[PDB]
Amino acid sequence: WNARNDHLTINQWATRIDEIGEVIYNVREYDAIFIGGGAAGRFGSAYLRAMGGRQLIVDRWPFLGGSCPHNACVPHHLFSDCAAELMLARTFSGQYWFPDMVVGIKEVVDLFRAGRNGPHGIMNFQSKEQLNLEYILNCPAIDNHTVFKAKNLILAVGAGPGTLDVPGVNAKGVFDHATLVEELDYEPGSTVVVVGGSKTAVEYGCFFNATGRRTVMLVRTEPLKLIKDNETRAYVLDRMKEQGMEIISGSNVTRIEEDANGRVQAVVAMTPNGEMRIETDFVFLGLGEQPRSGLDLGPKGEVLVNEYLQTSNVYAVGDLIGGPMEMFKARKSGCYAARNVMGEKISYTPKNYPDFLHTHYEVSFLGMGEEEARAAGHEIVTIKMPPDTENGLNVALPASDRTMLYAFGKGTAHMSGFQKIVIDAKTRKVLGAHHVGYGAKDAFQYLNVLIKQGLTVDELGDMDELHLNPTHFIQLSRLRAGSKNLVSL
Amino acid sequence: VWNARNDHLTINQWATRIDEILEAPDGGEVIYNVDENDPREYDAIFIGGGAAGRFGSAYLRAMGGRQLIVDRWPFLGGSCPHNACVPHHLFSDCAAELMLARTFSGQYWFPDMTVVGIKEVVDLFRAGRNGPHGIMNFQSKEQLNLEYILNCPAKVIDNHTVEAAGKVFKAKNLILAVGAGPGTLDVPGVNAKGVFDHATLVEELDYEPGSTVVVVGGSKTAVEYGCFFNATGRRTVMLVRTEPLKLIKDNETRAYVLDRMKEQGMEIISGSNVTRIEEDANGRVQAVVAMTPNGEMRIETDFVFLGLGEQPRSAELAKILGLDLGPKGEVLVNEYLQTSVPNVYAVGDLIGGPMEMFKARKSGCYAARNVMGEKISYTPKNYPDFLHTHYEVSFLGMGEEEARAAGHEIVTIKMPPDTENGLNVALPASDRTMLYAFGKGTAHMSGFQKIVIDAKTRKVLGAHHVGYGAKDAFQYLNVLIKQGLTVDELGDMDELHLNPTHFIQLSRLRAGSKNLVS
Ligand SMILES: Cc1cc2c(cc1C)N(C[C@H](O)[C@H](O)[C@H](O)COP(=O)(O)OP(=O)(O)OC[C@H]1O[C@@H](n3cnc4c(N)ncnc43)[C@H](O)[C@@H]1O)c1[nH]c(=O)[nH]c(=O)c1N2
Ligand SMILES: Cc1cc2c(cc1C)N(C[C@H](O)[C@H](O)[C@H](O)COP(=O)(O)OP(=O)(O)OC[C@H]1O[C@@H](n3cnc4c(N)ncnc43)[C@H](O)[C@@H]1O)c1[nH]c(=O)[nH]c(=O)c1N2
Ligand SMILES: O=S(=O)(O)CCS
Ligand SMILES: O=S(=O)(O)CCS
Ligand SMILES: [Mg+2]
Ligand SMILES: [Mg+2]
């Protein structure tokens, strides 16, 4: 279908994408052909075009934007929203406007499926009409100059879900993030088994638990290693366990038992305390994504690239080059490859970036944890909420938007959140920041920039805080910055 | 007088004790926390231990000076925990959650919403407000090493002399931090039962309001409380004296906010002045009569909320000290927070607008630094700002029309885009707007945001956001913008997708061009 001279609206695009199928054909020599039009390929194309170069995107999906809108970040955020709202409803069940509190997993997945063509339509419309891009969609993509001829290739095919080499892994009722939003044709029973212990497993597991299902996470090593501050990690894990989640470390699935109809009936796992069998008809695999890869490859199948994103005229970007598999990495690697193709030699080594994951809370972190900073030899002070006292977490701070009910409810104050900054006592520089609650994720983007510039506790204290703020760092810093001899709070 | 100096109560013990003192029929004991073994003179006595006095004391003590806080409240922190910022946020949380529940009424886990008790939420606040009070007393004494006398009005004798708890204290300076009182209306029936302000709402609500609420004013307070009252299921009429939400300078952002308020059922009346509050034979409000641009209006109601500007508490102190006052009763100060009276500073809401926590705390600290010999000026402006409706509304810098009127060639980067589909598209979207983004016919509710950029310098001139989870970000973003942030530098940050503000990645989408395009 030649839609080059066809100007459809966002919602007309959404409809056409749902309908599709025919190849969507929207077409100087090409400076680069992008193999894949996800975050890396789409942003790389946008930047290359904006620089005045010629680009072509070829993707097997009939929409641009890749996994993010179809089965990754967007559905994850919808599920995390549900997890947080459901924790609130269950905590205040039968109080105020809250009714007596099992949420239908399939209805939420079906809501996502019914609405995901909105973002698809925005992607196709914005890419064609506003970003001036050429693309061929709903078509899978010869040599380092041939696909169409181009001066360079930029490989941006992403990564695929990790698999498990155990009997029963293909049983009906085993899902990953990709298949959950394509093949869920029943409502899961009362138990969920989640395999894995990092972001995807924890985010989806907290959603399943929030729907009212007994949720058992089988973690190969130790959960949430990305949270380096020990107290922050312990708060996050403690709140997950209080919600009823069961986290079993050092455990490996031995087999997924199939019933006579081919459906999951149980998971058998080895743990440090021996073998256990969990009855379930629903298993979610939250394992690491695997790059879709004469290129030199790394140990995990990632395509090897130098600091200019060049492989062994062929660049590679995004999840295809391995961790960190985040949207900032995919989009920046795509743009930087495009700039190098267009003659602007610029290196990219992702380092000292902010990070985040969802449980029933938003969990934001950057820089050093407290113990990590001390083990590196720093005199450190910490400024945190709640304070270290005999009352512990059972006090009405920290408190901000979407945490006030916890702060004021009977016996719920410990759920109002946790946060901390780690400060070098000699330089007065902020070395790390950590937050559990809501509404700080966005701030950590900009805070990390200030910290990379050399932010001190005095400079933090001298800012204008928008009370009551998700992060209390500004004013709590101001309470201590008047002393040349810094003291923790 | 309770000599508390050598008692070391926990946070929760403080919460209980403050509750007891606040409920004592005889007013309760004076809380006396003075280091009677320290021979040093007081560098400053703070009249008031709210945000300004408490932070000023903390900073002065941290610098090595001696301070003495004297407040009439049995707790530190002032209006913020007791009847201002804290209860406000509690109510705004409720307003946002209730808009969500009403939008998805009878779907997923949500109950059928086709009237929430205002009194039970206020009672919840009253039952839990001692927690913050306890932390304030505990942090101030055990962590910040502050001296204070609470549950005792201060009696200023002169510019170096103050009486408290039957004793006279001398100080090198006074720092006045008594704040402001609720604004009132000079109309017949204003003292009727059923007429409340932010202070009286959390102390005197002994009944559950009826189906209609009349809010007087267009302040942040008026809009914040109004949205909460509307969200409980009540017809809510706002009587704005001038034009609503003038603080939102960007016309597009303001229009989005107002449109969403009206979609929730709020009636916003501009150019309006209450002429009388009608009382029934029981002494309770039965109606509000107001002059509007469309003539006289009479609204039947048994519940009126006044959200007028706060009035600096300057009268007594100006008589005793001879302080120069401004037209609204604010205490006049130079840029070092010095009043007209030697060795007397004034801070916080007492010095007038802007009446914000950052202003109160920073003015307290800068006064303290000047007292301690560090000449430092404080003139607040180019600060970020926010308010609640059923959404969080965040803004800094220039609106689009304001930037053009100031002579800038500008481009804008916004979500949703200007297309035939308008707001009815699934962006912007992030935490706490995903249901709106995906729901049947609710996409327009997923928010609105815009940055304003100078087309020549590429500098970001202003930022505006309606949604959730960007308020905290605007604190740090404003600093970066005051440093001279360009669209290129913004594009080069690390975003945390899906982000409340999409500014980073959308900037990156346009930053590749020499000639910027919206
Ligand atoms: C469940 C879950 C949740 C999240 C995340 C991942 C997952 C699995 N991520 C990570 C994020 O999704 C990831 O980093 C980016 O989507 C990677 O973008 P790429 O463009 O590299 O791959 P991506 O997979 O997006 O794009 C690859 C594209 O190439 C196409 N393709 C593949 N093979 C092809 C062929 N042979 N021919 C043509 N086309 C082909 C595919 O169709 C696809 O469109 C994330 N990150 C984040 O920052 N925040 C978050 O909240 C989350 N959340
Ligand atoms: C309803 C509402 C909602 C909000 C806000 C205000 C209001 C009214 N504010 C503004 C904020 O509350 C205000 O700017 C600060 O609390 C001002 O702090 P001060 O210390 O100046 O006065 P504050 O009023 O807090 O303190 C004055 C203290 O002096 C004491 N005092 C008075 N007379 C005395 C006497 N004779 N002797 C001894 N002590 C005496 C009082 O007891 C009181 O403790 C706000 N700001 C913001 O930044 N974000 C927000 O969300 C909100 N929300
Ligand atoms: O990064 S992309 O804009 O392509 C997809 C966002 S869901
Ligand atoms: O600013 S204070 O910490 O004094 C009160 C906050 S509610
Ligand atoms: Mg707490
Ligand atoms: Mg929208």
UniProtKB/Swiss-Prot annotation, chain B:
Query: For NADP(+), which residues are the binding ones?
Result: 218-221, 241-242, 356
* Name of the top EC class for this enzyme: oxidoreductase
A biological process (GO) annotation for this entry? Answer: propylene catabolic process
Q: Which reaction does it catalyse?
A: coenzyme M + acetoacetate + NADP(+) = 2-oxopropyl-coenzyme M + CO2 + NADPH
Q: List the disulfide bonds.
A: 80-85
Chain residues that bind FAD = 51-52, 79, 154, 349, 357, 497
> Keywords for this entry?
Disulfide bond, FAD, Flavoprotein, NADP, Oxidoreductase, Plasmid, Redox-active center
Q: Identify the Pfam families for this entry.
A: Pyr_redox_2, Pyr_redox_dim
Per its UniProt record, the required cofactor names are: FAD
- What top-level branch of life does the organism fall under? Bacteria
User: Which pathway does this polypeptide act in?
Assistant: Alkene metabolism; propylene degradation
Summarizing activity control, the record says: Inhibited (at 40%) by the coenzyme M analog 2-bromoethanesulfonate (BES). BES is a time-dependent inactivator of dithiothreitol-reduced 2-KPCC, where the redox active cysteines are in the free thiol forms. BES does not inactivate air-oxidized 2-KPCC, where the redox active cysteine pair is in the disulfide form. BES specifically alkylates the interchange thiol that facilitates thioether bond cleavage and enolacetone formation during catalysis.
Asked if the Swiss-Prot or TrEMBL record annotates the protein with the keyword NADP, the reply is: yes
Record comment regarding domains: Contains three domains, the FAD binding domain, the NADPH binding domain, and the dimerization domain. The binding of the substrate induces a conformational change that results in the sequestration of the substrate at the dimer interface.
Q: What else is known?
A: The active site is a redox-active disulfide bond. 2-KPC reduction and carboxylation assumes the formation of a mixed disulfide between the interchange thiol (Cys-80) and coenzyme M.
What do we know about how this protein assembles, alone or with others?
Answer: Homodimer. Component II of the aliphatic epoxide carboxylation complex together with components I, III and IV.
Q: Write down the PANTHER family for this protein, in alphabetical order.
A: GLUTATHIONE REDUCTASE (NADPH) (PTHR43014:SF5), MERCURIC REDUCTASE (PTHR43014)
According to UniProt, the name of this protein is: 2-oxopropyl-CoM reductase, carboxylating
**Organism for this UniProt entry:** Xanthobacter autotrophicus (strain ATCC BAA-1158 / Py2)
Give the encoding gene's name: xecC
